[PDB]
């Protein structure tokens, strides 16, 4: 029922999910001049060498690549995090034009798209239990700007034809998420929420300062996806982003000076 259109989009979500007006909602605008460098943040550890991708899926809101999270293969540790968080899936949010598409903004700047690598805290045993905790999830957010092509994204782009419409999936094994990361792991962090229903307030956000560059041709292939299922009126999957939400009492911390 929920979506991104005029009658079902983010301004409607609070009716089914009243937490949409909560105290720790995401995304937010990252005011880079208000964020506090925190010299005590431990270093961030992104350990993706043993990642096992499984499937790529159009879920009617984004497309996602799913991973085997039955053991500690691809994990995020350190930084603001206590313990070990396992990679479950990544997906993207993007625009109809290159000047919008990201969920987080940086000094009000929107990027063309935003990559989310979703992880769950292993002390809670499964993602469903993790979803119910205030420290259950950690999402690594990476901005995309249009310029040079990202070679490590091309295998993803090339399979999107096969998952055009909601409900379609394909095998997507041996994909290496390391190829999606920028050079620097400098980041901002704050406590927030899922940016889609059910908008659960259980996410530690880690948003990288350095965007990755992707080509116009790569983002154009995202915009050929459809929100609708096969047979229904064609509605391009574009502008699948929630806008910035109130910061409320929160502090954004920077890992860098
Ligand atoms: N933009 S985001 O904050 O990274 C969250 C993206 N949301 C999704 O993938 C969802 C909702 C969801 C349902 C069950 C879950 O266990 C998790 Br986890 C997320 N799709 O239906
Ligand atoms: Zn997301």
Set out the fold topology:
Layout: H1 13-16, E1 29-30, E2 36-37, E3 44-47, E4 53-58, E5 63-67, E6 75-78, E7 85-94, E8 105-106, E9 113-121, H2 127-130, E10 137-146, H3 154-159, E11 169-171, E12 187-192, E13 203-208, E14 212-214, H4 216-222, E15 253-254
Parallel strand pairs: 1-8, 2-15, 10-13, 10-14
Antiparallel strand pairs: 3-6, 4-5, 4-11, 5-7, 6-7, 7-9, 9-10, 12-13, 12-15
Task: Please provide a written account of the structure.
The chain has 257 residues and is mainly beta. It has a single domain (1-257), classed as Carbonic Anhydrase II, CATH 3.10.200. The protein is 8% helix and 29% strand. The radius of gyration is 17 Å and the shape is globular. Psammaplin C (OE2) binds at residues 59, 116, 118, 127, 131, 137, 139, 194-196. One of its GO terms (biological process) is positive regulation of dipeptide transmembrane transport. One of its GO terms (cellular component) is myelin sheath. Residues 1-256 form the Alpha-carbonic anhydrase domain. Interacts with SLC4A4. Interaction with SLC4A7 regulates SLC4A7 transporter activity. Interacts with SLC26A6 isoform 4 (via C-terminus cytoplasmic domain).
